[PDB]
Scaffold this motif. Structure first.
Motif, PDB file in Angstrom:
ATOM      1  N   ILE A   1       0.847  -1.195   0.000  1.00  0.00           N
ATOM      2  CA  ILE A   1       0.000   0.000   0.000  1.00  0.00           C
ATOM      3  C   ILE A   1       0.878   1.239   0.000  1.00  0.00           C
ATOM      4  O   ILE A   1       1.790   1.376   0.823  1.00  0.00           O
ATOM      5  CB  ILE A   1      -0.963   0.006   1.201  1.00  0.00           C
ATOM      6  N   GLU A   2       0.635   2.136  -0.958  1.00  0.00           N
ATOM      7  CA  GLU A   2       1.269   3.443  -0.936  1.00  0.00           C
ATOM      8  C   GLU A   2       0.434   4.460  -0.168  1.00  0.00           C
ATOM      9  O   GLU A   2       0.976   5.237   0.625  1.00  0.00           O
ATOM     10  CB  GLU A   2       1.500   3.943  -2.365  1.00  0.00           C
ATOM     11  N   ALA A   3      -0.878   4.463  -0.381  1.00  0.00           N
ATOM     12  CA  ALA A   3      -1.718   5.470   0.239  1.00  0.00           C
ATOM     13  C   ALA A   3      -3.168   5.035   0.157  1.00  0.00           C
ATOM     14  O   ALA A   3      -3.545   4.176  -0.650  1.00  0.00           O
ATOM     15  CB  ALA A   3      -1.544   6.838  -0.437  1.00  0.00           C
ATOM     16  N   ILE A   4      -3.975   5.646   1.014  1.00  0.00           N
ATOM     17  CA  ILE A   4      -5.420   5.573   0.926  1.00  0.00           C
ATOM     18  C   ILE A   4      -5.893   6.857   0.271  1.00  0.00           C
ATOM     19  O   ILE A   4      -5.606   7.956   0.766  1.00  0.00           O
ATOM     20  CB  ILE A   4      -6.061   5.387   2.306  1.00  0.00           C
ATOM     21  N   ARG A   5      -6.603   6.724  -0.845  1.00  0.00           N
ATOM     22  CA  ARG A   5      -7.128   7.899  -1.530  1.00  0.00           C
ATOM     23  C   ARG A   5      -8.473   8.325  -0.960  1.00  0.00           C
ATOM     24  O   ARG A   5      -8.755   9.521  -0.836  1.00  0.00           O
ATOM     25  CB  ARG A   5      -7.260   7.609  -3.024  1.00  0.00           C
TER      26      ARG A   5
ATOM     27  N   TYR B   1     -11.640   1.098   1.696  1.00  0.00           N
ATOM     28  CA  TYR B   1     -10.664   2.127   1.353  1.00  0.00           C
ATOM     29  C   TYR B   1     -10.194   1.959  -0.085  1.00  0.00           C
ATOM     30  O   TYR B   1      -9.927   0.841  -0.542  1.00  0.00           O
ATOM     31  CB  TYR B   1      -9.442   2.097   2.269  1.00  0.00           C
ATOM     32  N   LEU B   2     -10.091   3.082  -0.793  1.00  0.00           N
ATOM     33  CA  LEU B   2      -9.564   3.088  -2.151  1.00  0.00           C
ATOM     34  C   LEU B   2      -8.043   3.150  -2.073  1.00  0.00           C
ATOM     35  O   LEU B   2      -7.477   4.162  -1.656  1.00  0.00           O
ATOM     36  CB  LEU B   2     -10.134   4.276  -2.929  1.00  0.00           C
ATOM     37  N   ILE B   3      -7.373   2.061  -2.451  1.00  0.00           N
ATOM     38  CA  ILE B   3      -5.948   1.888  -2.212  1.00  0.00           C
ATOM     39  C   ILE B   3      -5.162   2.271  -3.457  1.00  0.00           C
ATOM     40  O   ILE B   3      -5.435   1.772  -4.552  1.00  0.00           O
ATOM     41  CB  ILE B   3      -5.637   0.434  -1.807  1.00  0.00           C
ATOM     42  N   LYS B   4      -4.181   3.153  -3.291  1.00  0.00           N
ATOM     43  CA  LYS B   4      -3.122   3.330  -4.274  1.00  0.00           C
ATOM     44  C   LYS B   4      -2.013   2.335  -3.942  1.00  0.00           C
ATOM     45  O   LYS B   4      -1.452   2.391  -2.853  1.00  0.00           O
ATOM     46  CB  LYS B   4      -2.586   4.756  -4.228  1.00  0.00           C
TER      47      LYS B   4
ATOM     48  N   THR C   1      -4.892   4.004 -12.155  1.00  0.00           N
ATOM     49  CA  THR C   1      -5.958   3.160 -12.686  1.00  0.00           C
ATOM     50  C   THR C   1      -5.941   1.755 -12.101  1.00  0.00           C
ATOM     51  O   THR C   1      -6.899   1.003 -12.312  1.00  0.00           O
ATOM     52  CB  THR C   1      -5.864   3.083 -14.211  1.00  0.00           C
ATOM     53  N   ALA C   2      -4.889   1.383 -11.375  1.00  0.00           N
ATOM     54  CA  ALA C   2      -4.861   0.092 -10.700  1.00  0.00           C
ATOM     55  C   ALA C   2      -5.376   0.155  -9.268  1.00  0.00           C
ATOM     56  O   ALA C   2      -5.343  -0.869  -8.579  1.00  0.00           O
ATOM     57  CB  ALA C   2      -3.443  -0.480 -10.703  1.00  0.00           C
ATOM     58  N   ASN C   3      -5.842   1.316  -8.800  1.00  0.00           N
ATOM     59  CA  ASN C   3      -6.392   1.398  -7.451  1.00  0.00           C
ATOM     60  C   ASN C   3      -7.530   0.402  -7.286  1.00  0.00           C
ATOM     61  O   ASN C   3      -8.261   0.105  -8.235  1.00  0.00           O
ATOM     62  CB  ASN C   3      -6.939   2.794  -7.147  1.00  0.00           C
TER      63      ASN C   3
END
Length: 54
Positions: free
Chosen positions: A4-8, A19-22, A29-31
């Motif tokens: 996980i890089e971040a939660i958008r 949670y929408l995951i980056k 577009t792969a989130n």
């Protein structure tokens, strides 16, 4: 790979938090929407495995 890089974003659907995951190293577009329950289980699975050793 997946890390996980971040939660958008946060959203709640049918009573469940997602949670929408980056993902690190993947395009936006792969989130993916990941259930909170699955992410929380990770810490539980780690702790139970460590406790078994011991």
């Amino acid at each position: 790979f997946y890390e996980i890089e971040a939660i958008r974003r946060k959203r709640v659907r049918k009573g469940k938090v997602q949670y929408l995951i980056k993902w690190r190293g993947w395009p936006e577009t792969a989130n993916t929407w990941e259930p909170l329950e699955n992410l929380q289980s990770i810490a539980d699975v780690i702790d139970a495995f460590e406790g078994s050793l011991k």
